[PDB]
């Protein structure tokens, strides 16, 4: 009967490996789950018996061949495999001599120290279980397991890497029942993978000195080409944090070369060239980036990427998507003052986002970043720094056309804190307005400066009384965003009141922004320009002393740029008179 069970395990292991090497995407996973259910049934048949010593090395061979092909298909380990480990371990314990895996492992390794001749399979089981606890981030007790494996005198070695290196695989793995993978093949993987994860954590925690060692360890040995890239890329960032640009460049270049997937490098390239301020190069890298991200096999084995994590947003291996990036490009461009270019980028952005009905979806920017309306604004703001004002309006038209079916229907207009206006709707109106200024139309402009200002006063934005939806968390709630946006619409108006010659009205509106937001300072400049005209001495000096008594946090992009865009050059020059 053990003849037939071993013949069956060997048969299904040959099926699995034939499928891994050969075949098409379906027939692969069809034969793989075929073999997984064969191994399931065979494990049930062997686990039916109150295991004998000669039944044990086949049962553990089956447990290994099952767990490997289970987690390589799922493309992740879980705790079902750990319960199956507990099952097989207490099955080894009940033969010769319960509570939990850690003490069960201690007692099973004491039983293995008696040398029953299944240590080939016990070391392979430690590799699987070690991988599990590695993918589960359980690195304290993994030290305890491998510590019990080796001498208990290696107890002070809390670092895993030394401990895994000293842990030898037991044997050349003599003519036993067939296995899909050897303990040393798993040891290699464990080493590079752990090296890798320690390195990333040390990098993100501002220790890119420590990282270099572990990661070079990740370079040296088995590390598949795809990972190799990733590691080097970390190094880009490490030397980048250091100051050492060129080492960085060199690694990055390799990463490119060795790459089939060189999104992430050029992203570090960008950050680097920013650190120099080499704006020209900066933008280029990113352009290239986008086309890169334009263009786009799983073995039934335990490879590294299985044990690798999904990276964070703080990683230098965080690379978004096409659309998300294009946004960066346009964003970055807009801050520099390449407004025209910026626009075209932003329109291409928008084209992508909205027009994508036919192909694969092309997504919007993620919400540590700006929401889909903060963006359209940035679209229209560039279009204003082009002097493309009749476009900037076909945008703010299309915007308030889609979003009618939200808005505040403004009956408080007749009844005139309580109703709600998301900051962005107040602003659309502000910029509709600046747009009309470039096309030179006092009236219909000062329509829009007053119509903003009302939706900043007979509304508060800060109105979530009901969790009714999804919202701008960040951009469109800041009291900083509000007191800066007011201060603007009032500044925007005060100018138009001087273009028509009503220095009384302009005075009112400027004096109002001051009283409101005292740390824009372009507010004080316009008022003191007004005062130097009319009523210099007393007023002016009283506000000098106030400014010098007084002496950016998260302002969203469409407004920053718009403040910079209106603001004047001899501003400090005026404040020193």
């Amino acid at each position: 009967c053990l003849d037939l069970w071993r013949e069956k395990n060997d048969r299904l292991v040959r099926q699995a490996k034939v499928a891994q090497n050969s075949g098409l995407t379906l027939r692969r996973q069809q034969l793989a789950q075929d073999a997984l259910e064969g191994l399931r049934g065979l494990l049930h048949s062997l686990q039916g018996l109150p295991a004998a010593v000669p039944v044990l090395p086949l049962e553990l061979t089956v447990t290994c061949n099952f767990i490997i092909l289970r987690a390589s298909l799922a493309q992740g380990f879980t705790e079902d495999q750990a319960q199956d480990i507990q099952r097989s371990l207490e099955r080894v314990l009940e033969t010769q001599e319960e509570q939990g895996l850690r003490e069960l492992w201690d007692s099973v390794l004491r039983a293995s120290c008696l040398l029953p001749e299944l240590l080939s399979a016990l070391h392979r089981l430690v590799g699987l279980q070690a991988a599990l606890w590695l993918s589960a981030d359980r690195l304290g007790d993994l030290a305890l397991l491998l510590e019990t494996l080796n001498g208990s005198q290696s107890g002070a070695s809390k670092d895993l890497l030394l401990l895994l290196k000293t842990w030898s695989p037991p044997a050349e793995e003599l003519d036993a029942p067939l296995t899909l993978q050897d303990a040393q093949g798993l040891k290699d993987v464990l080493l590079t993978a752990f090296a890798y994860r320690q390195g990333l954590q040390e990098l993100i925690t501002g220790n890119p000195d420590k990282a270099l060692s572990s990661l070079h360890e990740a370079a040296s040995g088995l590390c598949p080409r795809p990972v190799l890239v990733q590691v080097y890329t970390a190094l880009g960032s490490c030397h980048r944090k250091m100051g050492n640009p060129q080492r960085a460049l060199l690694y990055l270049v390799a990463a490119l070369k060795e790459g089939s997937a060189w999104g992430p490098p050029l992203l570090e390239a960008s950050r680097l060239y920013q650190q120099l301020g080499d704006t020209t190069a900066e933008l280029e890298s990113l352009e290239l980036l986008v086309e890169a991200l334009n263009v786009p096999a799983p073995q039934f084995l335990i490879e590294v990427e299985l044990l690798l994590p999904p990276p964070d947003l703080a990683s230098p291996l965080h690379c978004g998507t096409q659309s998300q990036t294009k946004h960066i490009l346009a964003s970055r461009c807009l801050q520099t003052g390449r407004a025209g270019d910026a626009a075209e980028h932003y329109l291409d952005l928008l084209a992508l986002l909205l027009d994508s009905s036919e192909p694969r979806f092309s997504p919007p920017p993620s919400p540590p970043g700006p929401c889909m309306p903060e963006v359209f604004l940035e679209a229209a703001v560039a279009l204003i720094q082009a002097g493309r004002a009749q476009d900037a309006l076909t945008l703010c038209e299309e915007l308030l056309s889609r979003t009618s079916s939200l808005l505040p229907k403004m009956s408080r207009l007749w009844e005139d804190e309580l109703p709600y206006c998301p900051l962005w709707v107040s602003a659309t109106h502000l910029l509709q307005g600046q747009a009309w200024v470039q096309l030179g139309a006092q009236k219909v402009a000062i329509s829009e400066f007053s119509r903003c200002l009302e939706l900043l006063f007979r509304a508060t934005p800060e109105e979530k009384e009901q969790g009714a939806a999804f919202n701008c968390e960040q951009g469109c709630k800041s009291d900083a965003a509000l007191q800066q946006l007011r201060a603007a619409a009032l500044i925007s108006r005060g100018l138009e009141w001087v273009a028509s010659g009503q220095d009384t009205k302009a005075l009112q509106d400027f004096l109002l922004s001051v009283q409101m937001c005292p740390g824009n300072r372009d507010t004080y400049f316009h008022l003191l320009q007004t005062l130097k005209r009319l009523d210099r001495r007393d007023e002016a000096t009283a506000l000098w002393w106030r400014l010098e008594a007084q002496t950016l946090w998260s302002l969203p992009l469409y407004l920053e740029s718009y403040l910079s865009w209106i603001r004047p050059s001899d501003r400090d020059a005026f404040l020193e008179e």
Binding site: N244, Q246, R247, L250, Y251
Partner: protein, 32 residues
């Protein structure tokens, strides 16, 4: 150079560009 095996491959890159044996550039660069 002021910042190992990479720095050797970099001098190899420069040598392949200039058509100079790597020794000449390495010596010149170390001296400078």
């Amino acid at each position: 150079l002021l910042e190992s095996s990479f720095i050797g491959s970099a001098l190899q890159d420069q040598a392949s560009r200039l058509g100079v044996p790597v020794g000449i550039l390495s010596a010149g660069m170390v001296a400078s």
